[PDB]
Amino acid sequence: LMEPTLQSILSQKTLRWIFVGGKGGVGKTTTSCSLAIQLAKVRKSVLLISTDPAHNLSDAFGQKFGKEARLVDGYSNLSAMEIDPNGSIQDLLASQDLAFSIPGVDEAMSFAEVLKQVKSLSYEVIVFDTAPTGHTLRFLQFPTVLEKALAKLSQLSSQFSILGARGGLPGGQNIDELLQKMESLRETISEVNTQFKNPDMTTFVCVCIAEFLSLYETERMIQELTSYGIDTHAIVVNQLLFPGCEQCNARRKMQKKYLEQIEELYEDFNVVRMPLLVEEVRGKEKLEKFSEMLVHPYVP
Amino acid sequence: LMEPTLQSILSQKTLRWIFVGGKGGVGKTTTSCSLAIQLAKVRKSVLLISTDPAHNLSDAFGQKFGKEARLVDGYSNLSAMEIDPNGSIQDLLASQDLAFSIPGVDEAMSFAEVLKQVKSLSYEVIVFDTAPTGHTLRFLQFPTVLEKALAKLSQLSSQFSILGARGGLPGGQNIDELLQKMESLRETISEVNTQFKNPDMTTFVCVCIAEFLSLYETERMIQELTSYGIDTHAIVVNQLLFPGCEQCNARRKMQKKYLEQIEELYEDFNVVRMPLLVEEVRGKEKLEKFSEMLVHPYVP
Ligand SMILES: Nc1ncnc2c1ncn2[C@@H]1O[C@H](COP(=O)(O)OP(=O)(O)O)[C@@H](O)[C@H]1O
Ligand SMILES: Nc1ncnc2c1ncn2[C@@H]1O[C@H](COP(=O)(O)OP(=O)(O)O)[C@@H](O)[C@H]1O
């Protein structure tokens, strides 16, 4: 058996990267925070980075976060930052909606620079608030993007005096000097990428509603994940109804059906069940109470 | 303003093609049948054709339908058929998931033949039960597919004796004989296609749940429809909850949010509201009862 709990994850002290993803307002952001909070109780320090363009990480903790890692107010070991994509005009010029799917060299480089920073901070574990868009796993092309750049750059190093200062490239670029930045970012990117592909160090937590369109987008994201080689073994099924009002009962009979499907398809998964709450899960005190149900199965 | 009723549509006696689309088990099939049943009351005769691979058109009426138009059991002017796609091995050989998105010449031709049949029957109006897949509007490529064929076919017809029957093509294809079937299938496809692009003659009715993923997939499918120039001005919002049980009330508060969004975006639309019923809408009597609500807004 595999209990309906994220306990197996919280207990892993070798985990360094924990992704949280889910498409279409199923409560991905709420789960990212809840998982982070519950991790602060067990790990030395927890960094919460967000690739999400809505930056709901703020509206959630009701506190403004930037590209600088700040401390989540009610905590001492929990910190959060919001990463900016930083795609360039060049990035764009270099490229139905899969037309903007491949990252540019400038965007990939910027992310590598942020991972560099993050490593310096020496945060114990990192909860990765993924983007609930079409490009959830876009950052997984950064290794191949930088390698292709490092290659086209080295192939150019072979194209190289009396002329002195006037004898350099027009535009001022220093090839052997960029070949360093590029090699250094590529190495940083590759370290983290092979960490991602290590089940002992990196796992992916799916969030979903018990509707069709969500259950679908979920199996579709787990396929993509399994292809890239990123471990996933936990599904959080959010906004569930639990047992004098008839029509509300019918809506629950349907949940039971979708819920049986999930329990069948993902037998090998922890399937965590969260109840729809009556108020928004916004406060820190509310996020706490909500987070408890990630480790202690809810009961009426 | 625009009342929450499909009444405006049932009143258009110039309508010949009425599409029903909706992705993800939101009650598309049920709407297609309901809309036809309501149409049979006002129009001389109604044909219900289905591109939906699931052929839920049977499970809905509890009656087996084929590629031959049969009469729906409890009716006298309502008939249903289920179109088979008929993609060939060639078709496949000639080609993410947008890899099988362009139809083959053999599939396009087959559908043209069916449209040909259907025009012979002289049904007053047709309800078009679309496929709730990623290929909902796939048939709209048939004109361009057949035109490219008729072209490549005509070009070979300029590159073609004392050889007698030995002077034929190998394969036995008769070019001038095919240039006819192809011209005739193109002409049937074009007729029907320029009808689709006529608001007086063709409109598209969308079906959806009040969830995000569906409200999204809906604005997405309307965009594509508008691009192809196919008229759309009605949304059916299915499975809604209506006003001692607290947690169900919360689930309704969320619907209210989604429903307000819909009323705002689709101000120019008829936004029909359907309740979640306690039993499946399967029987003919149950479909009738459901279909009445497409023209008489539901109240507690
Ligand atoms: N189990 C739940 N019960 C009640 N409200 C919830 C629940 N999960 C999420 N919410 C609320 O619904 C919205 C979900 O937003 P969020 O958690 O950010 O999902 P996403 O980040 O995917 O949009 C937020 O207002 C959140 O407070
Ligand atoms: N408003 C409703 N109330 C209760 N049950 C419904 C309603 N709409 C659809 N259903 C049932 O839910 C399922 C919807 O299936 P269907 O109508 O075929 O949608 P789709 O064709 O998109 O799958 C069917 O069992 C149908 O009987």
Side-chain angles (χ1 to χ4, degrees), chain B residues 47 114 214 242:
Chain B
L47 179 54
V114 179
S214 190
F242 283 116

Side-chain angles (χ1 to χ4, degrees), chain A residues 25-30 56 238 275-277 279-282 290:
Chain A
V26 308
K28 180 227 58 168
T29 280
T30 285
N56 268 359
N238 198 30
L276 170 68
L277 300 191
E279 290 171 359
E280 287 177 336
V281 189
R282 198 151 319 288
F290 183 84

Side-chain angles (χ1 to χ4, degrees), chain A residues 23-26 96-98 209 211-217 220 224 239-254 257-258 275-280 298, chain B residues 23-26 96-98 209 211-217 220 224 239-254 257-258 275-280 298:
Chain A
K23 208 200 167 183
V26 308
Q96 297 165 332
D97 42 30
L98 267 39
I209 306 171
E211 298 288 347
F212 181 80
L213 288 174
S214 191
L215 258 51
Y216 171 77
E217 210 75 31
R220 174 169 207 72
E224 220 197 356
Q239 305 182 22
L240 288 166
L241 299 187
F242 284 116
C245 54
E246 184 191 17
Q247 170 170 110
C248 197
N249 266 323
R251 170 82 178 98
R252 187 179 50 76
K253 274 206 308 189
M254 300 190 62
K257 267 141 196 150
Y258 286 124
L276 170 68
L277 300 191
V278 187
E279 290 171 359
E280 287 177 336
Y298 173 84
Chain B
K23 205 187 163 191
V26 310
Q96 277 301 296
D97 44 31
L98 268 36
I209 303 178
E211 300 288 350
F212 180 84
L213 286 172
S214 190
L215 257 61
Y216 170 75
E217 213 82 29
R220 180 169 202 69
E224 219 202 352
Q239 304 186 14
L240 291 164
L241 296 186
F242 283 116
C245 53
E246 184 194 12
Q247 165 168 112
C248 198
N249 265 326
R251 169 81 174 90
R252 189 177 45 75
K253 275 202 314 184
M254 291 195 73
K257 263 132 200 160
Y258 285 128
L276 173 77
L277 307 188
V278 185
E279 289 170 0
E280 287 174 341
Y298 174 82

Side-chain angles (χ1 to χ4, degrees), chain A residues 153 172-182:
Chain A
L153 211 65
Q173 307 95 315
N174 182 357
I175 280 211
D176 294 320
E177 186 172 300
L178 289 173
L179 219 62
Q180 291 195 219
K181 277 147 213 153
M182 202 60 69

